[PDB]
Design a protein around this ligand. Structure first.
Ligand SMILES: */C(=C/C(=O)OCC)[C@H](C[C@@H]1CCNC1=O)NC(=O)[C@H](Cc1ccccc1)NC(=O)C(=O)NCC1CCC1
Length: 181
């Protein structure tokens, strides 16, 4: 088997988990140790359903930039035995664009799902349901409900988390390594 598909399947196996909050189904990225990331609008509570069991959340941190403005990402620290494989070295130091990327989704409704969103470009400001958001990127693919939390990847790099779309385009929150230091 080739190397792009090997890395994507390895993500699914070790780092990209099926979750449910009171807002419904999401894809969750485990970054290292007991630290994961979800979209802010998933509103993780005191507990979260992960794959086949209810896991306690020890801490949640919603990320905003210096402008006080929403970045649409919540860092969760989980109460588990599991250490996630550390994938911080695949996350660029600065939010990066990409050609021919793939969005990897993993939900109970959309399990191990691969979506070819194409090129991923700087976009910046986005308005999601009256919530202003910075540091977004855009792909010209008609993403859909149930795909938030999805992992934007390409060439062994992990560059975003899907948060939105308008029926013709999709949008992720950009990743940078400093968030997971
Ligand atoms: C993922 C979450 C979901 O399924 O929620 C359903 C209860 C979706 C995926 C979107 C929907 C349509 N196509 C997609 O890719 N995301 C959302 O629904 C966004 C939720 C949200 C984000 C931030 C703050 C609050 C809520 N919202 C949107 O996609 C949206 O409201 N508008 C799209 C439009 C383009 C820029 C604004």
């Amino acid at each position: 088997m080739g190397p792009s598909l090997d890395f994507a399947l390895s993500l699914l196996r070790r780092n990209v988990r099926q979750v449910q909050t009171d807002q419904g189904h999401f894809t969750m990225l485990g970054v290292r140790d007991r630290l994961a990331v979800l979209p802010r609008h998933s509103q993780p509570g005191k507990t979260i359903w992960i794959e086949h069991k209810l896991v306690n959340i020890l801490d949640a941190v919603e990320l905003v930039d210096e402008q006080g403005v929403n970045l649409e990402l919540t860092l969760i620290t989980l109460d588990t035995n599991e250490k996630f494989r550390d994938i911080t070295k695949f996350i660029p130091e600065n939010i990066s664009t990409a050609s021919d990327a793939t969005l990897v989704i993993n939900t109970e409704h959309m399990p191990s799902m691969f979506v070819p969103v194409g090129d991923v470009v700087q976009y910046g400001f986005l308005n999601l349901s009256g919530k202003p958001t910075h540091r977004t990127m855009m792909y010209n693919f008609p993403t859909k409900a149930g795909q938030c939390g999805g992992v934007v990847t390409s060439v062994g790099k992990v560059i975003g988390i899907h948060i939105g779309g308008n029926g013709r385009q999709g949008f992720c929150a950009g990743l940078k390594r400093s968030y997971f230091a």
